[PDB]
Amino acid sequence: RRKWRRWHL
Amino acid sequence: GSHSMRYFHTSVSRPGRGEPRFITVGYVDDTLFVRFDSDAASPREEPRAPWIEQEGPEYWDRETQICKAKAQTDREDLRTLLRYYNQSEAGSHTLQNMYGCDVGPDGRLLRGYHQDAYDGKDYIALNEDLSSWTAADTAAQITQRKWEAARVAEQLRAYLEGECVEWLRRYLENGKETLQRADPPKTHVTHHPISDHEATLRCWALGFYPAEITLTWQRDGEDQTQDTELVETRPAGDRTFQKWAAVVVPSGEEQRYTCHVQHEGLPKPLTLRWEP
Amino acid sequence: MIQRTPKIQVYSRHPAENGKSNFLNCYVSGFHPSDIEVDLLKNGERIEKVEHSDLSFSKDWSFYLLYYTEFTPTEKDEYACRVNHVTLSQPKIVKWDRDM
Ligand SMILES: [Mn+2]
Q: What is the 3-state secondary structure (H, E, C) of chain C?
A: CCCECCEEEEEECCCCCCCCCEEEEEEEEEEECCCCEEEEEECCEECCCCEECCCEECCCCCEEEEEEEEECCCCCCCEEEEEECCCCCCCEEEECCCCC
Last residue of a domain, one of B122, B147, B181: B181
Q: Of B86, B81, B83, B148, which Cα lies nearest the Cα of B116?
A: B81
Task: Tell me if A1 and B76 make a contact (CB, 8 A cut-off).
Answer: no
- Which of B62, B150, B167 is opposite residue A7, by nearest beta carbon? B150
Could you tell me which chains touch chain A, where touching means 3 or more CB pairs under 8 A?
B
Binary contact (C55, B10; C-beta < 8 A): yes
Asked if residues B90 and B75 have their Cβ atoms less than 8 Å apart, the reply is no
Task: Find which of B156, B160, B170 to mutate to test the A interface (most A CBs within 10 Å of its CB).
Answer: B156
Experimentally, the structure was elucidated by X-ray
* Cβ contact B37–C54 (<8 Å): yes
- Taken in order B173, C13, B202, C31, the sign of the CA dihedral is negative
Instruction: State the resolution, in angstroms.
Output: 1.5
The residue segments making up the domain with residue B175 are 1-181
Using the mean position of ligand 1's atoms as its centre, give its distance from the Cα of residue C63 in Å.
43
Q: In this structure, are B148 and B211 located in the same domain? A: no
C29 contacts on B by Cβ (under 8 Å): 232
Let me know whether B204 and B139 are in one domain: no
Distance B196 CA to ligand 1 centre (A): 7
Q: What domains are defined for chain C? A: 1-100 (2.60.40.10)
Distance CA B131, CA C80 (A): 49
- List residues bridging with B215 in a β-sheet: B261
**Which strand ranges, in their side-by-side order, compose the sheet holding B222-223?**
B222-223, B214-219, B257-262, B270-272
- Structural domain total, chain B: 2
Long-range pairs for B11-19: beta carbons < 8 A, 24 or more residues apart: B11/B71, B11/B74, B11/B75, B11/B78, B11/B94, B11/B95, B11/B96, B12/B92, B12/B93, B12/B94, B12/C33, B12/C34, B12/C35, B13/B78, B13/B92, B13/B93, B13/B94, B14/B92, B15/B89, B15/B90, B15/B91, B15/B92, B19/B71, B19/B75
- Nearest-CA distance A6 → chain B (Å): 8
Q: Are residues B226 and B96 in the same domain?
A: no
Residues on chain C bordering chain B, Cβ-to-Cβ distance under 8 angstroms: 1-2, 4, 7, 9, 11, 13-15, 23, 25, 27, 29-30, 32-35, 53-57, 61-63, 66, 68, 99-100
Q: Which helix (H) or strand (E) holds B192?
A: strand B186-193
Residue B164 phi, psi (nearest 5): -60, -50
In angstroms, what is the span from residue B197 Cα to ligand 1's centroid? 7
The reply to whether B32 and B150 lie within a common domain is yes
Looking at the fold, whether B96 and B162 belong to one and the same domain comes out as yes
Nearest chain C residue to B237 by CA distance is C13
Torsional class of B89: left (φ above 0), alpha (ψ -120 to 50), beta (otherwise): alpha
Residue of B nearest to A2 (CA): B63
Element counts in chain B: helices (H) and strands (E): 5, 17
Same domain? For B188 and B155 the reply is no
Other C-beta atoms within 10 Å of B73: how many? 19
Question: CA gyration radius for chain B?
Answer: 23
Please check whether residues B61 and B154 belong to one and the same domain.
yes
Q: How many CA atoms lie within 13 A of C30 on its CB side?
A: 11
Do both B156 and B188 map to the same domain?
no
CB B141 within 8 A of CB B125: no
Query: Do B194 and B237 belong together in one domain?
Result: yes
Whether the Cβ atoms of residue B105 and residue B126 lie closer than 8 Å to each other: no
In angstroms, the CA B131 to CA B150 distance is: 13
From C18, C31, C54, C25, select the one nearest B120 (Cα to Cα).
Answer: C31
Ligand 1 centre to CA of B263 (Å) is 40
**Do residue B163 and residue B231 come from a single domain?**
no
Question: What is the longest distance spanned by two Cα atoms in chain B?
Answer: 71
> Which residue, B159, B181, B203, sits at the end of a domain?
B181
Assign residue B204 a region: left if phi > 0, alpha if psi is -120 to 50, beta otherwise?
beta
Nearest-Cα distance to chain A for B144, in Å, is 8
What is the end-to-end Cα distance of chain B in Å, rounded?
Answer: 38
Contact A8 B152 (CB under 8 A): no
**CATH number for the domain harbouring residue B4:** 3.30.500.10
Give the contacts of C19 (CB within 8 A, at least 6 positions apart).
C72, C73, C74
Of the candidates B238, B100, B81, B228, the one whose C-alpha atom is nearest the C-alpha of residue B165 is B100
Residue C19 burial by Cβ neighbours in a 10 Å radius (0-12, 13-18, 19+): exposed
CA gap B73, B125 in Å, rounded: 17
Nearest-neighbour CA in chain B from C45: distance (Å): 23
Q: Is B190 in the same domain as B104?
A: no
Question: How far apart (Å, rounded) are the C-alpha atoms in residues C100 and B216?
Answer: 17
Interface contact A9-B116, CB threshold 8 A:
yes
Q: Which CATH number do you get for residue B228? A: 2.60.40.10
Residues 6+ apart with CB under 8 A from A9: B77, B80, B81, B84, B116, B123, B124, B143, B146
Which residue of C34, C66, C99 is in closest CB contact with B94?
A: C34
**Which of B181, B203, B235 is a domain's end point?**
B181
**Residue C49: is it exposed, middle or buried by C-beta count within 10 angstroms (0-12/13-18/19+)?**
exposed
Q: Is the dihedral of CA B206, C18, C53, C81 positive or negative?
A: positive
Query: Vertex B79, ends C36 and B151: CA angle to 5°?
Result: 110
For residues B193 and B90, membership in a common domain is answered with no
Closest CA to C58 of B230, B245, B235: B235
Q: Other CB atoms closer than 10 Å to residue B260's CB: what's the count?
A: 16
Measuring CA to CA, which residue among B215, B254, B136 is closest to residue A9? B136
Q: How close is the Cα of B252 to the center of ligand 1, in Å? A: 15
If you measure from the C-alpha of residue B195 to the centroid of ligand 1, how many angstroms do you get, rounded to a whole number?
8
